[PDB]
UniProtKB/Swiss-Prot annotation, chain A:
Subunit structure: Forms a cylinder of 14 subunits composed of two heptameric rings stacked back-to-back. Interacts with the co-chaperonin GroES. Can form asymmetrical complexes, composed of one GroEL and one GroES, and symmetrical complexes, formed between one GroEL and two GroES oligomers. The asymmetrical complex is the functional unit. It was suggested that the symmetric heterooligomer may represent a transient intermediate in the chaperonin protein folding cycle.
Cellular compartments annotated: Cytoplasm
List of residues that carry N6-succinyllysine: 20
Organism: Escherichia coli (strain K12)
Post-translational modification: Phosphorylated reversibly during heat shock. Can be UMPylated on a tyrosine residue by SelO/YdiU, probably under stress conditions.
Family, as annotated: Belongs to the chaperonin (HSP60) family.
Coiled-coil residue spans: none
The protein, known as: Chaperonin GroEL
Shown segment, full-protein numbering: 302 to 376 of 548
Function: Together with its co-chaperonin GroES, plays an essential role in assisting protein folding. The GroEL-GroES system forms a nano-cage that allows encapsulation of the non-native substrate proteins and provides a physical environment optimized to promote and accelerate protein folding, probably by preventing aggregation and by entropically destabilizing folding intermediates. Also plays a role in coupling between replication of the F plasmid and cell division of the cell.
UniProtKB/Swiss-Prot annotation, chain B:
Organism superkingdom: Bacteria
This protein's name: Chaperonin GroEL
Function of the molecule: Together with its co-chaperonin GroES, plays an essential role in assisting protein folding. The GroEL-GroES system forms a nano-cage that allows encapsulation of the non-native substrate proteins and provides a physical environment optimized to promote and accelerate protein folding, probably by preventing aggregation and by entropically destabilizing folding intermediates. Also plays a role in coupling between replication of the F plasmid and cell division of the cell.
Ranges in a coiled coil: none
Self-association and partners: Forms a cylinder of 14 subunits composed of two heptameric rings stacked back-to-back. Interacts with the co-chaperonin GroES. Can form asymmetrical complexes, composed of one GroEL and one GroES, and symmetrical complexes, formed between one GroEL and two GroES oligomers. The asymmetrical complex is the functional unit. It was suggested that the symmetric heterooligomer may represent a transient intermediate in the chaperonin protein folding cycle.
Species whose genome carries this gene: Escherichia coli (strain K12)
Entire-sequence positions represented here: 227 to 301 of 548
Similarity field: Belongs to the chaperonin (HSP60) family.
Taxonomic path: Bacteria, Pseudomonadati, Pseudomonadota, Gammaproteobacteria, Enterobacterales
Modified residues (N6-succinyllysine): 51
Disulfide bonds: none
Compartment list: Cytoplasm
Swiss-Prot record, chains C, D, E, F, G, H, I:
Residue list for modification N6-succinyllysine: 34
Assembly information from the UniProt record: Heptamer of 7 subunits arranged in a ring. Interacts with the chaperonin GroEL. Can form asymmetrical complexes, composed of one GroEL and one GroES, and symmetrical complexes, formed between one GroEL and two GroES oligomers. The asymmetrical complex is the functional unit. It was suggested that the symmetric heterooligomer may represent a transient intermediate in the chaperonin protein folding cycle. Another study shows that the symmetric heterooligomers are substantially populated only in the presence of proteins that cannot be folded by the chaperonin.
Protein name: Co-chaperonin GroES
One BP annotation, GO: response to heat
Pfam families: Cpn10 (PF00166)
HAMAP family, per the entry: CH10 (MF_00580)
Alphabetical list of PROSITE patterns matching this protein: CHAPERONINS_CPN10 (PS00681)
Subcellular localization: Cytoplasm
Function noted in UniProt: Together with the chaperonin GroEL, plays an essential role in assisting protein folding. The GroEL-GroES system forms a nano-cage that allows encapsulation of the non-native substrate proteins and provides a physical environment optimized to promote and accelerate protein folding, probably by preventing aggregation and by entropically destabilizing folding intermediates. GroES binds to the apical surface of the GroEL ring, thereby capping the opening of the GroEL channel. Regulates the ATPase activity of GroEL.
Gene3D superfamilies to which the protein is assigned, alphabetical: GroES chaperonin (2.30.33.40)
Entry's Gene Ontology molecular function annotations: ATP binding; identical protein binding; metal ion binding; protein folding chaperone; protein-folding chaperone binding; unfolded protein binding
Domain of life: Bacteria
Gene that specifies this protein: groES
Length: 75, 75, 97, 97, 97, 97, 97, 97, 97
């Protein structure tokens, strides 16, 4: 993002994500099996787990659970 | 606060005391904000920014109260 | 291929896009601005005007120079390197010692 | 018919419209842009200004030159070949060795 | 009456309005455009500038010349023939052999 | 009173407002246009520029001349006759024989 | 106090605001217009340009002159008299005999 | 501190803001206008242009001069006095005797 | 690094942003305005124009000068000091004694 003062130009292969496979339809992108380690994942997941805890709204709870499922199990 | 230039002198005296800084301005808009962000992000100097309480006349007086509690000068 | 400026023209390469430190310790995030400093690479003979032969230029190949990014300044691509071509008139000073 | 530039004028033919490779291995698809490089074909005597006879130009028939596609640059058709006519003033450098 | 250009001025007559064949066999229908080619008819002494007498022009009465249809180019009517008057500065080249 | 142009200035009187016949037999009705032809009446010394004395003009009192009705052309009233005042620069040619 | 023009400058006083008679017997009522004629009162040394000393002007104190009421023409008040200050360049002719 | 104009520059002090009497006995109330008259205080060497050394100016320290309050005229503050700085070109005449 | 102006260029540092006292005893609060005064730091050889060698400048390293903050005035950063670069043409006077 540019909000951290980055430009696309100073980005080497190491800034790019990786997976084993991806598929995209007319309107559906899907990433199977990322290279990100289950340390980092389970870390980030436990963060969004505490987003639900302090989501004081209802529509705010809906989205958060969605990403947690996108990251934890499946949908 | 639009122009980062206005911060520089202060932001640097704060980089010698090694202590973080809270910026309570009337507002911190596009230009300056984006910068502060970039700066605080790279672990340069820890800084946060927040709008002043209320609006109109009391804002200035309420900001002033804040000065008193903290022993600082309204600018 | 190395370039060859055509009398009165100087070829320079820009320096750093606001070398992140302006002021001192504070790292100025990219605040919409460019660099005015640059290094000389090649220099032409001199100005033709006045008839009288051609007077050589006051810039030697390799000075660190401050210029005005005016209209007469053009941008070019050589071996894939970011270079500029302007006349001496657009060059303002040198950074010596 | 071969052309004949009228002192101070140079006749050049443009090169390749972003020779598809910019950067290295990557084939840059036509990204809305033109070529600034060109080859000399014919050259006039020289500039008349200052009265004093006519001083010859610094470009020999057949150099590879970088120019500024400015306003004074015109486009022409000769035997059905894409050619340009500008003054030396509009020519910026040479690509030697 | 035959005309008489006043030093530095050239009198030329335009050629064909996109001679219908551009490209080769294809007859380009009138696509909103004019002709840049023309023939000399009369020529003045020369440019006065610089004081120093008057230097004659490089165009002989009757050349086939390419010019720039700029602002300094005026249009005139002689015996009922379509003619143009511009200075040498507006003439760019000759079509020889 | 007869006039007296002040060096470099020419005094001319316009001719006919589209002499009703353009083309041949057809009488062109006034189609919103003026006349570019005129006759000389008086001529100043010459241009002062360059210091060097004053070079006389190439127009003799009484030529039939074509001029450009530009900005530098002014309109005047003498004894009640419609006259114009411009410099030689604004005069383009002569209609001889 | 009488004035003193500073080389190249002429001091003139306008004449009559459309002297009510234009055409002949008919008294043209004020039709929104001014006078272009004027009389010389004082004259400076001459033009400095070109270095070379100072060449005196071609207008003698007291001629009746036609000028162009251009931008370089200023308006002034002397002893309470309506006067104008312009350069010779703005003066076009003289009304002699 | 007394000032020091840098060749070609003149330092003048304005006179009175419409000296209340214009016309004669009638005291013109401030009608939105300024003064064009002024007095010289200091004078630079001369104009450098043309190379040739430096020709001195035609204004002596202390004349009463009429100038054109043009663009090249700047306003300044010295010891707390209202002063102006323009070049000779902006000065039009002198008020002698 | 100390700077090096390229002939005809002067390097100056501005003075005080309306030194709070204008008038006398009254402290003028910042009323939206800048300073026109400045000190010289470095000076180039001289102007090249006219061919004829190079004439040196009339400003010695260290004068207190008044300048016109025009367009040709640029702003620069040296060792972290606020500096300006303009030509002599933009400098108007000196504050001596």
């Amino acid at each position: 993002s540019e909000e951290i003062g980055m430009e696309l130009e100073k980005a080497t292969l190491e800034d790019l994500g990786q997976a084993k496979r991806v598929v995209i339809n007319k309107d559906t992108t899907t990433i199977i099996d990322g290279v990100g380690e289950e340390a980092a994942i389970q870390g980030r997941v436990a963060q969004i787990r505490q987003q639900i805890e302090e989501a004081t709204s209802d529509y705010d709870r809906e989205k958060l659970q969605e990403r947690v499922a996108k990251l934890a199990g499946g949908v | 606060i639009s122009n980062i230039r206005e911060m520089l002198p202060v932001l640097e005296a704060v980089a010698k005391a090694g202590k973080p800084l809270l910026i309570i301005a009337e507002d911190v808009e596009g230009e300056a904000l984006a910068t502060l962000v970039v700066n605080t992000m790279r672990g340069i100097v820890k800084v946060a920014a927040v709008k002043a309480p209320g609006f109109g006349d009391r804002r200035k007086a309420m900001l002033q109260d804040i000065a008193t509690l903290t022993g600082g000068t309204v600018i | 291929m190395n370039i060859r400026p055509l009398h009165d023209r100087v070829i320079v390469k820009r320096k750093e896009v606001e070398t992140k430190s302006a002021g001192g310790i504070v790292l100025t995030g990219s605040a919409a601005a460019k660099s005015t400093r640059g290094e000389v690479l090649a220099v032409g003979n001199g100005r033709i005007l006045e008839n009288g032969e051609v007077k050589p230029l006051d810039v030697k190949v390799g000075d660190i120079v401050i210029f005005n990014d005016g209209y007469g300044v053009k941008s070019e691509k050589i071996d894939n390197e970011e270079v500029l071509i302007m006349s001496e008139s657009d060059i303002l000073a040198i950074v010596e010692a």
